[PDB]
Write a protein that binds this ligand. Structure first.
Ligand SMILES: [Mg+2]
Ligand SMILES: [Mg+2]
Ligand SMILES: [Mg+2]
Ligand SMILES: [Mg+2]
Ligand SMILES: [Mg+2]
Ligand SMILES: [Mg+2]
Ligand SMILES: [Mg+2]
Ligand SMILES: [Mg+2]
Ligand SMILES: [Mg+2]
Ligand SMILES: [Mg+2]
Lengths: 101, 50, 106, 126, 48, 142, 186
RNA sequence: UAGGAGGGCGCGGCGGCCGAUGCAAAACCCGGGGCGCGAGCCCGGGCGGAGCGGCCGUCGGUGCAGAUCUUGGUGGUAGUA
RNA sequence: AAAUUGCCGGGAGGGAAGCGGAUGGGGGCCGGCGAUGCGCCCCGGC
């Protein structure tokens, strides 16, 4: 038989947020990026980084290679956090591993 | 976040300050908090309250 | 006399007599003594994480057990239990813990 | 290794609250469902019928969730999660998760040995 | 009239320059609002 | 803590990377915090190693015998993560290290809070170092 | 058995805490729980419970109405648990010290440019821990559009209640029941 | 009871965090031990042979004993008519 | 997996059985099922 209340494509997929409320939330998010306790608590390994906010010179701009990028992260205290990301990669449990995720 | 020096200096351009029409954005001013200093330690243990 | 004794005990005058604050007014001249502050150990071997609470050497002084009025020395007792159940014995005296000292005689 | 609890654990009921009539049907599960029937004599609480759970049966808040060991349990998956019980060893007992392998369990047991942490499935998978 | 200067972190191969810290942007001092974040994060995320 | 600690506690109280919470949101909930500068590993603002500028750490060192590491952060270096922490390696005797912990946790008014917890964590950390080396001797059930 | 209604238990409801999980308003509440607890300022008790209030129970106050209420009392601090909105219909505003949860941008500029102060409630507790020399003000609660529709029904005698109608014009809710020529006049 | 609300439990995805697993994952089985007033949950033993779980936010084709319910399988009737 | 069935071992039965509270008898299972340590001390070494 057919399902109860068959799903339709005219569900409300996309929801609108005020232009100003979007900007307010971005402002709050930016501020929190400058607080070491919150960047720690959200799971980033920031323990050899010199200063927050972490500003690096413009010479980084011109780099080219993933190997070049690796040195830059090492000269900061940033490569450890990139380590955790690469080491944590695994296959997604559940149905998503066959839904192109 | 790792900021480049090129980018960290544009932030004040992009978001401006507590002043009207300072942002690159139009019709926007940075939000002000409900509590100027959030230190309950300082307020509760100030001379005025004690 | 249970209540009569109780009334006597809580009398403000008589508790002063009982405790003996006189004759402690004697030693240390015209005053009642002071004290000091023990526990200056400065040598914890361990540090417990539970909020510690130390060993009790109780100051409470339980009253001695009463002897039944008809248990008077020389009286013959019957044992009601134990391996000598039914045996008739002689009552000698009450002991310090309250237990009765008896003899067969053997 | 010596538990802090200095108060006997009283249970007001040890039997479970089985579902009414789950003894009469097979496809009925024994998990508790409250009867909503209009004539249900279980719902109306006649004497001689199966009992319904109340808040009145609730166990003393002091000795709640303590195992007969007189420790409260916390399931660990690795040595790091074990080391969180270092300062709670007289209230909390560790227990290795059911899907922790034999190799990993030997490590947790070795490490729990030094920190003096009560472990309630120390012999499993060996 | 004062705001701290954020130290810029040099990198190997750079020419040593008489540079100084960038003053802290005003936005990096904005109120922290986690209720607003999760509200906006929910609604924005569903637009893809 | 570039913002106040009272504010930070508000943000990280209900969710953060160190809080391991088990057994639901009912009266069965058990929750611990595995951050290294929390002395009892308790998720509270008193013991929080996140929502305090002044925190104490008492850890057994890496592979090495009888070395206790004591760390205290610096109030004015909050925005310099690398050199926020002042750590000290002590391989002296217990009663002598009990003095060092008091000197840096209590007598300077750093965190008179954590006088008892720091010493108790030293007692537990130090004993774990003996047993690691000497091996298990006692069972401690008495 | 004891003869009581609902076991003698309270059936009314009041907000014992605010609804918003806004971190700064949560911090302000901790301050005023302490202040009511230790200082026993009756002013402090009012401020606390008004902090536990919904947006409709804390209506905005215009600067025109605030300027009227402050007139002659410019040695005191105006206190509003709510929002101060700017009013273009006013010209004279005295230098005045106002504490509120929010100021609109135009309002705050108008107050400051007069030589006043836009205080927060944390700043108020520094400068008045017991609410001394304060003017505690509310805004008009029954001024909302929704309030017009409240009360006796639109079609009963002596009621001037606004009806819920989708449009205005002659074809919408005018004929039978609104004039003598069509049936009756309400 | 009809009815209303609050706080929880459970199922499947998504964004994040924290983890288990060929030194044996899921599912299933048990006169195994426990926790919770309860929804449920944790562990033991076995079977199996490659995946899985907890927490925060968020979302839904999300919880069965009934409907002469739908489909499949199975009894007693009965070694009977 | 369940319904349902066979075999082996165990248990009970005078026109139903199952069920709720009690406990008694059998089983079956539980060693964090239940401790042997801490303080003074005398050496004899670390
Ligand atoms: Mg009826
Ligand atoms: Mg009329
Ligand atoms: Mg679906
Ligand atoms: Mg459905
Ligand atoms: Mg069914
Ligand atoms: Mg039904
Ligand atoms: Mg079967
Ligand atoms: Mg048989
Ligand atoms: Mg029976
Ligand atoms: Mg029995």
């Amino acid at each position: 038989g057919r399902m109860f209340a068959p799903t339709r494509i005219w569900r409300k997929w996309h929801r609108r947020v005020n232009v100003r409320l979007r900007r307010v939330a971005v402002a709050s998010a930016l501020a929190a990026t400058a607080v070491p306790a919150i960047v720690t608590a959200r799971g980033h390994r920031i323990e050899s980084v010199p200063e927050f906010p972490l500003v690096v010179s413009d010479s980084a701009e011109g780099i080219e290679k993933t190997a070049q990028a690796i040195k830059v992260l090492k000269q900061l205290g940033a490569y450890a956090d990139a380590e955790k990301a690469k080491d944590s990669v695994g296959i997604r449990p559940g149905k998503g591993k066959m839904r192109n995720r | 976040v790792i900021w480049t020096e090129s980018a960290f200096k544009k932030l004040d351009e992009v978001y401006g300050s507590f002043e009207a029409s300072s942002s690159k954005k139009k019709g926007f001013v940075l939000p002000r908090p409900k509590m100027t200093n959030a230190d309950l330690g300082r307020l509760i243990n100030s001379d005025e309250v004690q | 006399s249970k209540m009569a004794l109780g009334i006597k005990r809580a009398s403000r005058s008589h508790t002063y007599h009982r405790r003996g604050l006189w004759a402690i007014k004697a030693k240390h001249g015209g005053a009642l003594p002071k004290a000091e502050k023990p526990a200056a150990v400065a040598e914890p071997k361990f540090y417990p994480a539970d909020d510690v609470k130390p060993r009790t050497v109780s100051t409470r002084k339980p009253h001695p057990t009463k002897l039944r009025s008809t248990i008077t020395p020389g009286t013959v007792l019957i044992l009601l239990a134990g391996r000598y159940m039914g045996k008739r014995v002689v009552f000698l005296k009450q002991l310090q813990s309250g237990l009765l000292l008896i003899t067969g005689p053997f | 290794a010596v538990p802090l609890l200095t108060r006997k654990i009283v249970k007001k009921r040890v039997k479970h609250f089985k579902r009414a009539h789950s003894d009469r049907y097979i496809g009925l599960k024994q998990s508790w469902r409250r009867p909503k029937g209009i004539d249900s004599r279980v719902r109306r609480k006649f004497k001689g019928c199966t009992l319904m759970p109340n808040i009145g049966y609730g166990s003393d808040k002091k000795t709640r969730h303590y195992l007969p060991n007189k420790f409260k349990k916390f399931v660990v998956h690795n040595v790091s999660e074990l080391e969180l019980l270092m300062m709670h060893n007289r209230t909390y007992c560790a227990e290795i998760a059911h899907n922790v392998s034999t190799k990993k369990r030997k490590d947790i047991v070795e490490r729990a040995a030094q920190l003096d942490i009560v472990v309630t499935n120390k012999l499993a998978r060996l | 009239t004062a705001r701290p200067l954020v130290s810029v972190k040099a990198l190997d191969g750079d020419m040593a320059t008489d540079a100084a810290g960038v003053p802290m942007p005003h936005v990096m001092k904005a109120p922290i609002r986690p209720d607003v974040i999760t509200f906006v994060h929910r609604l924005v995320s569903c637009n893809s | 803590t570039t913002v106040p600690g009272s504010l930070v506690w508000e943000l990280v109280k209900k969710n953060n990377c160190f809080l391991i919470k088990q057994f639901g949101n009912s009266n069965a909930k058990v929750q611990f915090s595995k951050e290294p500068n929390n002395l009892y590993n308790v998720h509270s603002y008193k013991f929080s190693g996140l929502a305090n500028s002044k925190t104490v750490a008492v850890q057994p060192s890496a592979g090495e015998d009888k070395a206790v590491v004591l760390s205290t952060t610096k109030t004015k270096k909050q925005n310099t993560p690398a050199k926020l922490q002042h750590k000290t390696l002590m391989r002296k005797e217990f009663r002598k290290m009990a003095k060092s912990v008091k000197n840096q946790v209590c007598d300077n008014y750093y965190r008179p809070d954590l006088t008892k917890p720091a010493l108790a964590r030293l007692s537990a950390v130090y004993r774990s170092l003996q047993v690691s080396k000497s091996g298990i001797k006692k069972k401690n059930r008495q | 058995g004891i003869d009581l209604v609902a076991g003698g238990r309270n059936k009314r409801t009041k907000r014992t805490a605010p609804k918003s999980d806004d971190v700064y308003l949560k911090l302000l509440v901790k301050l005023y729980r302490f202040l009511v607890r230790r200082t026993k300022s009756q002013f402090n008790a009012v401020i606390l419970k008004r902090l536990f209030m919904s947006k409709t129970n804390r209506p905005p106050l215009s600067m025109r109405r605030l300027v009227r209420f402050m007139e002659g009392k410019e040695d005191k601090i105006a206190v509003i648990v709510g929002t101060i909105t700017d009013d273009q219909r006013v010209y004279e505003i005295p230098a005045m010290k106002v504490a509120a949860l929010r100021f609109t941008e135009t309002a705050r500029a108008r107050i400051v440019n007069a030589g006043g102060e836009c205080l927060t409630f944390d700043q108020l507790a520094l400068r008045a821990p017991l609410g001394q020399n304060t003017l505690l003000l509310r805004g008009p609660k029954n001024a909302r559009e929704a309030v017009r529709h409240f009360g006796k029904a639109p079609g009963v005698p002596h009621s001037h209640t606004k009806p819920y109608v989708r449009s205005k014009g002659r074809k919408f809710e005018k004929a039978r029941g609104r004039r003598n020529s069509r049936g009756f006049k309400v």
